[PDB]
Design a protein around this ligand. Sequence first.
Ligand code: KAI
Ligand code: KAI
Lengths: 248, 248
Amino acid sequence: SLIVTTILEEPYVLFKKSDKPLYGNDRFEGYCIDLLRELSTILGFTYEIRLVEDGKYGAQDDVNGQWNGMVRELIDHKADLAVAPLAITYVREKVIDFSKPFMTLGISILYRKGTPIDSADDLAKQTKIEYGAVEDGATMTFFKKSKISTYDKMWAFMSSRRQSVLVKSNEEGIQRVLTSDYAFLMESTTIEFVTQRNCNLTQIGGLIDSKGYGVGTPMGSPYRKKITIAILQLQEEGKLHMMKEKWW
Amino acid sequence: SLIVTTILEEPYVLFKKSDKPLYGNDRFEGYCIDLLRELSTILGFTYEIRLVEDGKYGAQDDVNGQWNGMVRELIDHKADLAVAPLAITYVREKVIDFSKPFMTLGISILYRKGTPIDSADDLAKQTKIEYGAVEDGATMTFFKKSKISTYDKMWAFMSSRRQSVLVKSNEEGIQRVLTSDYAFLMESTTIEFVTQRNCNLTQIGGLIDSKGYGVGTPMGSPYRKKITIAILQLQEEGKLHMMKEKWW
Ligand SMILES: C=C(C)[C@H]1CN[C@H](C(=O)O)[C@H]1CC(=O)O
Ligand SMILES: C=C(C)[C@H]1CN[C@H](C(=O)O)[C@H]1CC(=O)O
């Protein structure tokens, strides 16, 4: 019986609503929950869902070199699978395995409508409008690791004000955008979700890069291939598209 | 020194044009050639390029269960890598390994501009306008394996006229579109390339599904992970985007 680590994130994973107390895996619904279920069927496994305890996706501390969050749990064999909006990044592929992507997205900008801002560059070359990303995120990491002119400057900007422009959750990042002169760097899929519930927000510019989400397995895990096949199957039969329709 | 199987296909791989004869790996240029080179560097390997002998990507005979083309070569350890516009399909993941995708595309329609046709459905529900795909392709296989109402219909149509509507190459498929009442089912990226060199063609409707291209390795190969890491880096540093710009 497989230990599946994950994390709360609308509409990927979230506590279901009801009137009478819920226990175990019934506590959860969401796109990733649906997906977990489909894989569960196709590959014939039983599974226990656990929320990652530190509440983080996965980042590496420069100095000591330790990993945290879901990625850490995978490394330690404390979980068998990580099923979340976990980005397939190359720093991560060096420590865990990933199924082929069940979703392709990209970094982009969340800002309110009708500003002159039209791209990442327009943000970089000024200072009035602040900007940031989820701290220890894949998105933040992209900027930290980037030797592209524009993004290096934008990183320089953020790392110098992390106290105030780097947020701890996609929610908090959206709140900043809505309550100050702030533009948020988040994933396109999540932007696409938010720009429905909030009608004064929009995606500025296009996709900055092009990552995917994948199922996290400890390195060398047999399920990496199994789950890749299952996912390829789910794409090809329209179920993944249907599932996104459903939650967006 | 790695044996790399591949296949001629504009602009992924093609004999380079000059005034003097070229030999060995100099014979070739193209997006995949550039890619091969970049991987070559990052992972430090030497390689010999061979064109797949039967001239096919990879399909499985329905009687004897045998594989052909590049996929076959990988299975037989006759080649170490397949670097081509080779689609990551689940039937294939069942016999070889694939790097994560260096390109994401989708099946779509190539037809003439200004027809009432606007989708795969509009094609299905009639017979005047014929349609087809590359025989033994990923695209053909998609329809043959599909249980979706519309596409089962379209498959029924093709398998009944397989001789006259299933073509042997992307080129021949385009030639049909341009010389008869015919709509072609090809990959979006290749459509995107063709609709520049031919100004009366266009993509009808949207992406029908959502596959990627990956580097083919024999199952259990060390390079699958290595090459996945190398590709992830190449995406993250803009090189893959630049490479597409260059060849499109
Ligand atoms: C929900 C957040 C915390 C996660 C989700 N994907 C990215 C990841 O895999 O790290 C993070 C977002 C980001 O950095 O934009
Ligand atoms: C160029 C053709 C023959 C190949 C390329 N990708 C698909 C494959 O990987 O089979 C085939 C095209 C298609 O079937 O639309």
